[PDB]
Amino acid sequence: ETRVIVVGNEKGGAGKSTIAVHLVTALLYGGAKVAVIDLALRQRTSARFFENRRAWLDNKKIELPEPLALNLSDNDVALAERPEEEQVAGFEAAFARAMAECDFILIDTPGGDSAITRMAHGRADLVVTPMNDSFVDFDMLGTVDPVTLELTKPSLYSLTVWEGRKQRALSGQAMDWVVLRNRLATTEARNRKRLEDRLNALAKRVGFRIGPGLRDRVIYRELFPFGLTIADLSPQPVPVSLQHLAARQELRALMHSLGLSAYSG
Amino acid sequence: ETRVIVVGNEKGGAGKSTIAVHLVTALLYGGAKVAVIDLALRQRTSARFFENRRAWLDNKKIELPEPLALNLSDNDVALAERPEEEQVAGFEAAFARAMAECDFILIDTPGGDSAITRMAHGRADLVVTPMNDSFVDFDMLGTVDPLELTKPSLYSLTVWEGRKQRALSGQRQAMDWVVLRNRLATTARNRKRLEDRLNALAKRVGFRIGPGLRDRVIYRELFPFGLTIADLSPQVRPVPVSLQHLAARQELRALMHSLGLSAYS
Ligand SMILES: Nc1ncnc2c1ncn2[C@@H]1O[C@H](COP(=O)(O)OP(=O)(O)OP(O)(O)=S)[C@@H](O)[C@H]1O
Ligand SMILES: Nc1ncnc2c1ncn2[C@@H]1O[C@H](COP(=O)(O)OP(=O)(O)OP(O)(O)=S)[C@@H](O)[C@H]1O
Ligand SMILES: [Mg+2]
Ligand SMILES: [Mg+2]
């Protein structure tokens, strides 16, 4: 069937590239055959991750699953400068070509608005939208009243997904949308509550369902230079910590909630 | 003579808007007369902050310092769609008009690339560049080998060119560039590996490292009201006090000094 996952949030630093790289890496290890498309043309975090994996595995001469990384150009930083049309054309090539060869297409998007970004939301089966536990992030999903503090209306990014559905209702056939809270820390109780309320109210208005959070964790960020993740450090030498264990736990919970239980452990 | 501060990092979620809103608020309370310009045309986090302050102070009928918030349009979300030229024209109007009426101009920038963004880097006296303690963020400053540092990177160049553009108007008073680490958490190994590259890069690219902020609810918790710690006297209290407050106003102060604004703490 070939399912397409779009990781999205207009907000910067929501954790989009981090959830995408760990999604890919988990799927790979569930036998699946993944394609990774990175639409952050300049930053190219997912793309950079896997260039580092490539270069690393190579040097150490060990072997591990690699996705099928796909660029729009021979130089995307450069392509970022050409007009929308050329970017879209590039996307075209990369998407079409991945439809062929892969079971999942993982698309990581950038933290603003663009043609290719909008195009990706319209061709997606699942939209995973990680966010920070914070009203600053929440403001791209829904507008809250300063005095009352009631939610008040959907907001910029909500609309972006709402239109990526109307664009899937020309080719007729239901889009899962999951918002999960990422980089969770210790206390934050009062704020985590006020936020959790609006989060729910908004779900009813806009049609997403909340997934399980990840917590702030060095291991989610520490291995980027090598292009590795926790899913690569398994005992299957191997030093396992309580933290590593909590982490692969959360990832697993996450995987299930996205209905990818078929590919965990 | 009317100094201009540009908060910058191409990386999303580096903390730009959070450092800018607290800079403005600290300056205000040091007697200064600030202008706030937000070039994140869609998100408009700093602009949203102060619309909430406006609406909140109004409702509670209390009085507190407000900056001079400046829009490029009557609708910037809309302006985000017009061509570069029109955006730049809008900037023009807003910058020029703030040169007149203010001692500091605080410009918050978005987490990608744009004309107005590049224009702001060329007219800046100080560039405050907050980043996450993370190699993912670091990759927009400098490229590291999968054993170590090889070259400057996308955003380093953006500032390096905003200097060459200040070297037409020959400002003997060069541009100060400060990179500080933001959202610091508890536990060491990653914070060290990073701190090394951070220094090496400084020598190559010409910035100096400033004191970090730590991950703290209070830095994020008051956004809906458009308030900050600097507002939390006995009269203003929408939120119960924590021991955290003192450590917070501490870091802010340390920060302020390091940017040579000791005059306003
Ligand atoms: N659960 C987590 N635990 C620890 N670190 C995290 C976690 N999630 C994200 N990070 C780090 O947080 C920062 C933001 O994460 P990214 O995934 O890079 O965000 P993003 O949404 O891709 O941002 P852009 O720049 O808008 S794409 C990075 O420095 C990551 O290293
Ligand atoms: N020191 C801090 N403590 C706690 N939360 C923080 C801190 N710094 C930033 N945040 C939160 O981190 C997220 C990113 O910070 P922002 O200031 O929004 O980043 P940004 O650089 O404006 O990213 P763009 O503009 O969206 S790219 C927001 O949810 C803030 O509420
Ligand atoms: Mg990214
Ligand atoms: Mg912002």
Numbering used by the authors:
A (entry chain B): 3 to 175, 178 to 240, 243 to 271
B (entry chain A): 3 to 148, 151 to 191, 193 to 270
Sentences copied from the publication:
This study analyzes the determinants responsible for establishing bipolar gradients of the ATPase MipZ, a key regulator of division site placement in Caulobacter crescentus. MipZ belongs to the Mrp/MinD family of P loop ATPases, a heterogeneous group of proteins that act as nucleotide-dependent molecular switches (Leipe et al., 2002).
In addition, several residues from one subunit form key hydrogen bonds with the nucleotide associated with the other subunit, suggesting that ATP(γS) binding is critical for dimer formation. Most structural alterations occur in protein regions that contribute to the dimer interface, especially the P loop, the segment ranging from β sheet 5 to helix 6, and the first residues of helix 8, thereby repositioning the side chains critical for intrasubunit interaction. The MipZ dimer displays a central cleft that extends along the subunit interface down to the nucleotide-binding sites, with its bottom being lined by the phosphates of the two nucleotide moieties. The mouth of this cleft is highly negatively charged (bottom, central right). An additional substitution (G14V) replaced the highly conserved Gly14 in the P loop with a bulky valine residue, causing a steric clash with the γ-phosphate and the Val14 residue of the adjacent subunit that probably also interferes with dimer formation. The third mutation (K18Q) exchanged Lys18, which constitutes an integral part of the nucleotide-binding site, interacting with the β- and γ-phosphates of the nucleotide associated with the cis subunit.
